[PDB]
Design a protein around this ligand. Sequence first.
Ligand SMILES: Nc1ncnc2c1ncn2[C@@H]1O[C@H](COP(=O)(O)OP(=O)(O)O)[C@@H](OP(=O)(O)O)[C@H]1O
Length: 124
Amino acid sequence: KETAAAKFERQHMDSSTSAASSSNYCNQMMKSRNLTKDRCKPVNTFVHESLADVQAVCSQKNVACKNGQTNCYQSYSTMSITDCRETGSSKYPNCAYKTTQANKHIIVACEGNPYVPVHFDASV
Ligand SMILES: Nc1ncnc2c1ncn2[C@@H]1O[C@H](COP(=O)(O)OP(=O)(O)O)[C@@H](OP(=O)(O)O)[C@H]1O
């Protein structure tokens, strides 16, 4: 069964490209990472940094999670990310997304031993 750490990598890690490669990046990625299987996941963020760099965020700035839990951490440095947001014309199973590249600080929730990212909370 897929662990939460493995799910995070599948849903949010894309180290192959250092930025949103094209206007069609999200359309391709949301589908290939199985994020449009059950429904069109409305929003999702991909991180273009090494896995090591992202895991290290778990020992960075401790901040409150959107859900009230306190196991969230904010990256000290900005990181290259791509936000994928479902366009109004998108209709399951024909999910469609707008691809947006940015350099922001990421906030992830971490759990376990080793302490690793399991959820993407926000970017600021
Ligand atoms: N503080 C937190 N806020 C939100 N979710 C958290 C938090 N800490 C851990 N999680 C877990 O982070 C996981 C997030 O998985 P999702 O598939 O919902 O992806 P996403 O939130 O990264 O988009 C959930 O665990 P699961 O593997 O059992 O589904 C969720 O329970």
